[PDB]
Design a protein around this nucleic acid. Sequence first.
DNA 1: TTGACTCTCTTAAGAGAGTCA
DNA 2: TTGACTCTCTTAAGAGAGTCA
Lengths: 162, 162
Amino acid sequence: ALTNAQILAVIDSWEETVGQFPVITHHVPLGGGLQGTLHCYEIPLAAPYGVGFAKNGPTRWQYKRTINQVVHRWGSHTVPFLLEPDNINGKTCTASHLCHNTRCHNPLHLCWESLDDNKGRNWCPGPNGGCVHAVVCLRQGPLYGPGATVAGPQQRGSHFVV
Amino acid sequence: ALTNAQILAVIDSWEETVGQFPVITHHVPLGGGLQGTLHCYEIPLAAPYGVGFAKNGPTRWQYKRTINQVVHRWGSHTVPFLLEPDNINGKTCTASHLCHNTRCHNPLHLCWESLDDNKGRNWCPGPNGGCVHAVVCLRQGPLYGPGATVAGPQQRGSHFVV
DNA sequence: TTGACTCTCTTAAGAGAGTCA
DNA sequence: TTGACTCTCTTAAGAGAGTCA
Ligand code: NA
Ligand code: NA
Ligand SMILES: [Zn+2]
Ligand SMILES: [Zn+2]
Ligand SMILES: [Zn+2]
Ligand SMILES: [Zn+2]
């Protein structure tokens, strides 16, 4: 809600509830042929999810609290960042999963960045493979690699140059 | 429907028309601190665009040819790939700008790959900075770099471990 | 047969808000 | 007040199809 105290109370309640989500260990590629281990705090697959939580889409949830007799609601991963600017360079700030695990609500696996920065982590080589993200990746992006391109650049005639 | 020869004729007419688009020389990052040059064949900003071409969205165009009284229409960047498989790994193939310049229709600046592979090139370090795309990038992706993350992973209490 | 417009849709990273009990 | 559902929207890489003369 409006007050900094009220916002801290929301973050604290959220952390306590998410802290009771099941902790699932995931071993992950780091880049450079190395492997690491992440501990994701995963929201349940079906109701009940936890106090304050409800599912609004297949992999979307919201956190809600009643403050001043009014319901306040947020995207379930946005709560850690309620005291941060909600935009950057004129782009909306989004909750970004460093663990690439949507059900995970561990705030140690989340950052707050533009949607472009968020998306780009999918292809990052990882913290041991050349990640240059200033807020470092926790793992190599799941889509990193050579790709599966069907056809490359080509022309039939002689009208084009690179 | 259209025979191999007829498809080849569509590709040839498309190349003839695109080859007459304004050719714009762009200096671009290659990765590794090096700069290179790309020559983009840019569709005009407003009508007329060229024989067979029409705008269906702010940066979307289509190519149309009428063969034996039947109107055929394709996305304007898909024409170079009409003789290629249109899916791979159960994913639709998309025209992917190696030059990251949507108005460009140079077929030497296009490849044909899944939408995920396509998007991922936005963050590639480039052909001189570590690109691992099997069909190599022509330049460093425009979104490569440290990012502009507003807030990193953090907790207020001690409920979580990474 | 052609040009110049019109409309909505896909994907996978993300969102806000209303209906009931 | 709290829970469990429902709906549509945003973005930026991409698409197909209709109308009129
Ligand atoms: Na993400
Ligand atoms: Na692209
Ligand atoms: Zn996680
Ligand atoms: Zn990274
Ligand atoms: Zn180009
Ligand atoms: Zn590349």
